[PDB]
From Swiss-Prot, chain A:
Secretion signal span: none
Function: As part of AP-5, a probable fifth adaptor protein complex it may be involved in endosomal transport.
Gene that specifies this protein: AP5B1
Quaternary data: Probably part of the adaptor protein complex 5 (AP-5), a tetramer composed of AP5B1, AP5M1, AP5S1 and AP5Z1. Interacts with ZFYVE26 and SPG11.
The keyword Cytoplasm belongs to this UniProt entry's keyword annotation: no
Record keywords, A-Z: Protein transport, Transport
Official protein name in the record: AP-5 complex subunit beta-1
Presence of the UniProt keyword Flavoprotein in the record: no
BP-aspect Gene Ontology terms: endosomal transport; protein transport; vesicle-mediated transport
One GO CC annotation: AP-type membrane coat adaptor complex
UniProtKB/Swiss-Prot annotation, chain B:
Keywords annotated in UniProt: Cytoplasm, Endosome, Lysosome, Membrane, Protein transport, Transport
PROSITE patterns reported for this sequence: MHD
Protein family: Belongs to the adaptor complexes medium subunit family.
Record lineage: Eukaryota, Metazoa, Chordata, Craniata, Vertebrata
A Pfam family assignment: Adap_comp_sub
Membrane topology: Peripheral membrane protein
Gene source species: Mus musculus (Mouse)
Primary subcellular site in the record, as a coarse category: cytoplasm
Xref: InterPro entries: AP2_Mu_C_sf, AP5M1, MHD
Protein's job: As part of AP-5, a probable fifth adaptor protein complex it may be involved in endosomal transport.
Protein name per Swiss-Prot or TrEMBL: AP-5 complex subunit mu-1
GO cellular component: AP-5 adaptor complex; AP-type membrane coat adaptor complex; cytosol; late endosome; late endosome membrane; lysosomal membrane; lysosome; membrane
Domain MHD: 192-454
Amino acid sequence: DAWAQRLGAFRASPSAFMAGPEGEDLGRDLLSDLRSEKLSEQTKVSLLALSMEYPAQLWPDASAAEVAATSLLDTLVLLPPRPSALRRPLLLAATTALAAGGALGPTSGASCRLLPLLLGLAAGEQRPLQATACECLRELESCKPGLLGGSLGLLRGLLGQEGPVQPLSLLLALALRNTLVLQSRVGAGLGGLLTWDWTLVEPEEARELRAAVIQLLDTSYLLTPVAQAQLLWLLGWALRGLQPPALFKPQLVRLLGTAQLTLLHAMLALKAAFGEALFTAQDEALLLRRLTLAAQHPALPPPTHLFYLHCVLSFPENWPGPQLCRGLLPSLLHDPMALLARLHLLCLLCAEELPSPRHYLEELLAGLRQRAALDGGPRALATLCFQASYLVACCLAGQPTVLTPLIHGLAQLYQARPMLAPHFVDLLDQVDSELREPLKVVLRQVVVSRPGRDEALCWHLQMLAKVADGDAQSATLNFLQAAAAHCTNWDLQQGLLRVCRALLRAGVRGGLVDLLQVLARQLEDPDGRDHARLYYILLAHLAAPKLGVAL
Amino acid sequence: ALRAVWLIRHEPGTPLGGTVRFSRRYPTVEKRAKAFNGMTYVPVPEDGPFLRALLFQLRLLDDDKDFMERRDGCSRINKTSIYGLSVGGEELWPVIAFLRDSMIYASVPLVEQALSPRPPLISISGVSQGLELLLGIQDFLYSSDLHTKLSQLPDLLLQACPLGTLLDANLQNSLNSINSVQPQKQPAWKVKAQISISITETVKCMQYGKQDIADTWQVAGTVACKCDLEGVMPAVTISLSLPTNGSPLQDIIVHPCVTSLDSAILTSSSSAFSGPYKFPFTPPLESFNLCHYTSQVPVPPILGSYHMKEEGVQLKVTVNFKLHESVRNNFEVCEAHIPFYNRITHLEYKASFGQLEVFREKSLLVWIIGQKFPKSMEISLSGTLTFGVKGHNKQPFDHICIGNTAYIKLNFRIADYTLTGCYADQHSVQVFASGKPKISAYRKLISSDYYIWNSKAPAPVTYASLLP
């Protein structure tokens, strides 16, 4: 329990404890007992794991980072010459401290001592050490561009020699990209780079690069899917503008016969970056079919389904039929969050208007409404209905044929389930005017249709406030007058004056001098009555613009 | 390149919501995020605030709130599992998550461009990378050992994701490489030819049974194999012998380790030959799946019906089944469970075969048909189920079952008889190597979703079912 209680307070909160009194010397102790012998294997392992995990919290300044770098390097060299388990973690922790401290640079002794060490070690627990060192070198090269562009000839020559496929492959690819970009930015090329410089921080090449790409592809057969995806993504970045892609065409075509979440995205971004150079006019069709298939294939988890359902909608075109729209069209066998990924397809199909797609949309939205009206269910159902309504409204503002049933269904749904007041308010606050107005009219008609004796008044008044205007005066005034007697709690007594304030803003003048008057004279809480008095005075004594400027 | 990784077990009722079992942050990538993003940078919070925000956004922490416009809004639509967290007045983006068997998985990747316009998700590689790592962890932890699996995880993934960049997504391989210590291009996920192909064709069928409405059945199948043979490059591609009565393969997708899929597999979506099944693979230390197939057969295996005349409190479920002759008459568990959503006090039943044991809750009488149907191939239940005080919330509330609409949930299973016709063959082994394939093939049948849909009531319908 020498260091366990020490690291507990830090891994509870790094920035909080490092801002405390004891954390001032925590890094000092940790660097001190690095070469000690009183610390067991487990304590050293745990301390070095923390040194891995948060290099930004104990050595902020560049000078402190350099000092810690030299200290770690010293205790790594000065280790006992016996097989132990501090070899790789020490190098990786020093790399983390140097890279995240900002003290790395060619003009510093710590970096000039660390970099040759990692280069030699990775050049070749020997295999795990080599892998760890290669990863450290690649990460350092990522931190400062070109930092590790020194031994490219070594890896080129020793590709068949010792060294794990994945680390050297990734490091070589990253170095190629960074070095070639920098040198072509200068104006020159590789200049013999195929055979530890620090100056990069500030024809034959085609054949050499073709050899590089074939070697990378050949060695990539061992690459795991995730690393394979990043390799191909950055390669498709690099060689888009800078030999035909028919070298990598067989591999890409073969990999598109898969459905793994990473190779599919590698193929998708490869086509979205390379554009229409390699894509055929019909290969886009097969890719679209497979993405749509994978958007609903039972053998895959929900996340993969929804990922490809988002990919298909924003699919990247090469040179900007109905059956594909029938392999993904929504149903009511779909879990709540997998329909809205499919609603755009149905809105697209029905916009240009087998049962009539409007009829199927009516049945689907009617099922969603019937789910929503079920009292005693979760809120996911109502959220589904309203998000679907928003998507169709934005997508189909311009066809009253499909929209009149939607408006009628929403009105009936409000009549059935008054507890959904906030959802309608948000929808009204988002949708455009072409749908804001008729829905406003019909929902006002629904709310003022009842005499006003319901127990859902606290849910009616919210819509009444969110919709009241100067179109239908007398009906609204009658409904509000009836509802005045059914307000006993402060919540409804504020929704009601929210309605009156909405009328205020609209500009209605006559009769309101009595509606607001009666509300102010016949409510329960004093605060609502004073609210009404103020708003009635504002409407009665203001000119039209000054109310918008002084109320 | 991620920024951090998580694994939070779902703990209902606890105010914190769970106890993190894994929280590794890579600060090299955070400095990279500063350098790349610039003015749009938003830092990664600590464990506590992250857990609070993620459980809030996943709708898993106290969903009883009336309306939170930051979550339930009509303008914030989440059509993908890549959510955007809002921590410390900053919109963290992108944050990944999914749930299965009470185990959350999460990650925040790196985007190498500014966030002032939210870049399209068809471009960020990190979303795919985070999702795949999370799926690999999910497969590892609940593969089949209660805490010896979750204890070694921090010492497990470090060997796979040391400094923010993944190496291999199979955590079983991290266990193989850490606990146990390649001069050729041996695959980076590998540390007497015996193969255990466990094919499994689940018959889900909303049989319905109307005139214009089609009877909706579809069988979901898969093949789990392994070329777990010694040698340098042994070759064992197995053949599955669907008969002449059986259709060719249907709905083929493959494994990440799998090489490719045929142009017909790309075409035949929802060569068309029964052979020779030549499936290229790459011998894994994992279990390679050369394909997952959902075969079609025109003959439904079981047919059913259901009427519930709501004569007050008399849910007379005059059921009537029809066991197609192609189905072997020996069912391991043909429990024709009959849940009673939205509704047994008085089991005044008339069971033709097998007990109809009302369960102790007296809410859903799971009528165990048992093991085999009678010689009449028809059960029935004219039960005067005189239910007492109307349960409005106690009963299982299933929205896909309202009113006189419902269906019998037959949880029926069968050993080695499915609806497709899989039969692996070994005498036709053709390869560029030599060996003895011990192809321990198999099959099964499960009730994925076998709702014998009541034709005396409306049923939800898919798209093509109404299509003539």
